[PDB]
Ligand binder design. Structure first.
Ligand SMILES: [Mg+2]
Ligand SMILES: [Mg+2]
Lengths: 126, 122
């Protein structure tokens, strides 16, 4: 019982946090895009695309993608997992992160990788 | 009398990508399109974000972004141009392309740059 935060709530807090950080002289928020029936599919909209797009290359990666879950009792779907694998294979940092604190932590760690070098990973294995 | 709509232009480009291959699968699989207003903005939706996201790094670029216009008489908004500048600055290939043929030609030239080398420009 007692429900946790909704996913909309988790994402909104993360965005509000990003408005208070800076990257290259502007709010980090400016570098974050959220990609929110049959027509959309033929228009190219991909089911299970990660919630957050961060268009900055750092360390080993060409960009950052985050699939947000509201808490630890929510799980990525097969389409989300497949899209994450496709992104990783193409050299993007693409991860599931659950809850506000973990999403913020990933964004912090990603930026902290430093300038693109094609080498520095988020984790030992990925 | 009116030319093609932007929806129709984008759909033809997507249908074209379905018939192209990249690393064993349709090029279409690598293309993403991101489609009250206040809520979406505080959720992080950026007005003026390019229509087409291609999550492949080629030549000098970390990825490809295309702002589509339906024909030669249509032009980028200030927000669209600002986003394009931000993308280019971070090492993405970000362009305005107008009409079906030009959009397809940009995708063709981008893929042809080859594997990411950090130097080969469009
Ligand atoms: Mg999610
Ligand atoms: Mg457009």
């Amino acid at each position: 019982r007692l429900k946790g935060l909704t996913e909309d709530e988790v994402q909104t807090v993360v965005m509000n946090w990003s408005k208070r950080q800076k990257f290259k002289g502007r709010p980090l928020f400016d570098y974050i895009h959220h990609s929110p029936a049959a027509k959309f599919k033929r228009m190219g909209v991909k089911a299970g695309y990660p919630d957050l797009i961060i268009d900055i290359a750092r360390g080993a990666y060409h960009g950052l993608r985050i699939e947000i879950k509201k808490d630890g009792n929510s799980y990525a779907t097969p389409a989300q997992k497949e899209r994450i694998e496709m992104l990783a294979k193409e050299g993007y940092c693409a991860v599931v992160a659950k809850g506000i604190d973990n999403v913020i932590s990933v964004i912090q760690q990603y930026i902290k990788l430093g300038d693109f070098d094609g080498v520095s990973q988020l984790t030992a294995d990925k």
